[PDB]
Amino acid sequence: SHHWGYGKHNGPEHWHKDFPIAKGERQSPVDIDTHTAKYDPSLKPLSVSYDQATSLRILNNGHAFNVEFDDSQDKAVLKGGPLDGTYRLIQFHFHWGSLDGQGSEHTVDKKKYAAELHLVHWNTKYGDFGKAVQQPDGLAVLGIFLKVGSAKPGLQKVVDVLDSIKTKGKSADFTNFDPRGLLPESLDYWTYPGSLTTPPLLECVTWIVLKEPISVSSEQVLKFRKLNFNGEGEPEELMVDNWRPAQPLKNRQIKASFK
Amino acid sequence: SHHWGYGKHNGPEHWHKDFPIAKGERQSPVDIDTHTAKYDPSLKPLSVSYDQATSLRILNNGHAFNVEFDDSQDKAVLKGGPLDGTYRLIQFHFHWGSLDGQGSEHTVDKKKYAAELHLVHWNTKYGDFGKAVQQPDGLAVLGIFLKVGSAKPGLQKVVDVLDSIKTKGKSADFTNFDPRGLLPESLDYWTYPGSLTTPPLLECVTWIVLKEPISVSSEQVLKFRKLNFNGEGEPEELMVDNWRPAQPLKNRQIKASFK
Ligand code: NA
Ligand SMILES: [Zn+2]
Numbered sequence: 380s381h382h383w384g385y386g387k388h389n390g391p392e393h394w395h396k397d398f399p400i401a402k403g404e405r406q407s408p409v410d411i412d413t414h415t416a417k418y419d420p421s422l423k424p425l426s427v428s429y430d431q432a433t434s435l436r437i438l439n440n441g442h443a444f445n446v447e448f449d450d451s452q453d454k455a456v457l458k459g460g461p462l463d464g465t466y467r468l469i470q471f472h473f474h475w476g477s478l479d480g481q482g483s484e485h486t487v488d489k490k491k492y493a494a495e496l497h498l499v500h501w502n503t504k505y506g507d508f509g510k511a512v513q514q515p516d517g518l519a520v521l522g523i524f525l526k527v528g529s530a531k532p533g534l535q536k537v538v539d540v541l542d543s544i545k546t547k548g549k550s551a552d553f554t555n556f557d558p559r560g561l562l563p564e565s566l567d568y569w570t571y572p573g574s575l576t577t578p579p580l581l582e583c584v585t586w587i588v589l590k591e592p593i594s595v596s597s598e599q600v601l602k603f604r605k606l607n608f609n610g611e612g613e614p615e616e617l618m619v620d621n622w623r624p625a626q627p628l629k630n631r632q633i634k635a636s637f638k
Numbered sequence: 639s640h641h642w643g644y645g646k647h648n649g650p651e652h653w654h655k656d657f658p659i660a661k662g663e664r665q666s667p668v669d670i671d672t673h674t675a676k677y678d679p680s681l682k683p684l685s686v687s688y689d690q691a692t693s694l695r696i697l698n699n700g701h702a703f704n705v706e707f708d709d710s711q712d713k714a715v716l717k718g719g720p721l722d723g724t725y726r727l728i729q730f731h732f733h734w735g736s737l738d739g740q741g742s743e744h745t746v747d748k749k750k751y752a753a754e755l756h757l758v759h760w761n762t763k764y765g766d767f768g769k770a771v772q773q774p775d776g777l778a779v780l781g782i783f784l785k786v787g788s789a790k791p792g793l794q795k796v797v798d799v800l801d802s803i804k805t806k807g808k809s810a811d812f813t814n815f816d817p818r819g820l821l822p823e824s825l826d827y828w829t830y831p832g833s834l835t836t837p838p839l840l841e842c843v844t845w846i847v848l849k850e851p852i853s854v855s856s857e858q859v860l861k862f863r864k865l866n867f868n869g870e871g872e873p874e875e876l877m878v879d880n881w882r883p884a885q886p887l888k889n890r891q892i893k894a895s896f897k
């Protein structure tokens with residue numbers, strides 16, 4: 380089948396072959412230069428309403444692991460900030476490194492974090508995720524850096540189930556997970572127009588990247604590295620370095636909600 | 639689950655529900671008003687090079703039947719006219735009516751023909767059809783009107799095989815078919831920027847519609863009406879009136895190659 384990954388032959392440098400938008404004008408991630416990002420005090424506070432979030436399952440898709448939510452109603456939504464309308468949470472996933480010193484997709488003054496959490500939301504005025512991804516204003520991804528440090532209690536339920544989804548295609552029931560437990564205390568953010576960071580690389584994302592990282596323990600992130608990109612009974616290829624490097628900003632402006 | 643067709647409930651008037659681009663700026667087909675479509679002397683001579691065309695198979699896809707070609711090399715190409723680049727023939731198909739007085743998608747001064755032949759080509763530079771459909775210059779469709787009259791010898795080979803592809807999903811081998819035999823003597827044409835005339839209605843088509851129809855006998859076109867939209871063992875729904883009506887021109891200009 381058509382496929383892609385993060386290896387020498389199928390990795391980010393080659394994605395352009397099947398997905399020519401890889402060289403587009405609004406690609407993600409980007410490096411955030413804190414001295415040139417533009418303060419915009421017209422940006423509203425972000426409203427994160429996750430009180431009724433309903434997680435369903437966790438799965439290994441061969442590129443990362445997703446925790447999927449019931450997005451049939453407004454149970455977990457993002458509003459405000461730079462957004463117009465209501466964006467419903469569909470899933471979250473991470474990108475991470477082979478070493479603590481790398482793994483994030485966005486960087487801040489070229490600094491890489493150990494991992495990056497993406498909470499993926501779609502604009503309810505398009506009716507479903509499939510329609511939303513084909514629109515410039517279809518998705519809002521909230522990106523949250525993970526810095527190695529203190530353990531994050533809220534991540535532990537995720538870590539504890541990874542052994543049941545080791546290889547590509549494995550899934551497991553994953554109910555009653557509270558995504559509020561992955562948020563930092565400050566909701567100060569950068570924002571810019573961009574894309575999905577994996578194929579098909581669609582330019583449909585309003586990026587909202589939080590200034591404040593969450594901590595996770597060296598042991599928590601190590602558990603991510605023990606997942607496999609490959610399927611069961613295939614040669615073991617550890618799921619590490621599933622990040623796209625920073626792409627050119629081109630004519631875009633990154634805005635900060637804070638000075 | 640998603641379905642479209644040509645019935646009262648799933649037909650062209652409802653396509654916009656799942657495919658909002660149905661109400662876009664460059665939709666097809668259109669009515670060609672011969673009093674306002676003007677000669678454009680910047681148009682280049684149209685080159686149809688089909689001497690090495692290699693047909694492979696014929697199939698009923700539940701919406702029409704397609705004759706598919708080997709598009710791995712430049713064996714059957716369209717160049718010149720309004721096009722920049724070389725466009726490879728991938729398939730042809732028709733749209734037709736329940737009666738001889740209707741069936742074309744394009745109309746000329748509001749006149750409908752009994753059917754319309756679409757020769758579908760994609761721009762080599764995009765590597766394959768799938769990539770090409772996502773670009774405004776991806777496809778070139780040569781459209782040829784079928785007027786009921788004398789039998790067309792060049793169509794007979796197609797007619798003769800239809801009893802082997804009666805239902806959706808059936809296919810048959812269809813080698814050595816010469817698509818030059820479906821062309822009229824004049825390559826005078828009208829051209830405008832438009833779309834696929836079926837879902838997903840992507841706005842990736844340079845239309846080239848020939849002035850001169852080819853003749854089809856009443857019996858030849860009758861055979862098209864004995865095909866079935868449905869699969870084998872499903873209720874019989876005869877494959878007729880699989881045409882989209884003319885859409886608004888909006889801000890486009892239709893150019894003529896001839897004075
Ligand atoms: Na007219
Ligand atoms: Zn991501």
Ligand SMILES: [Zn+2]
Pocket residue numbers: 731732733756835
């Ligand atoms: Zn057609």
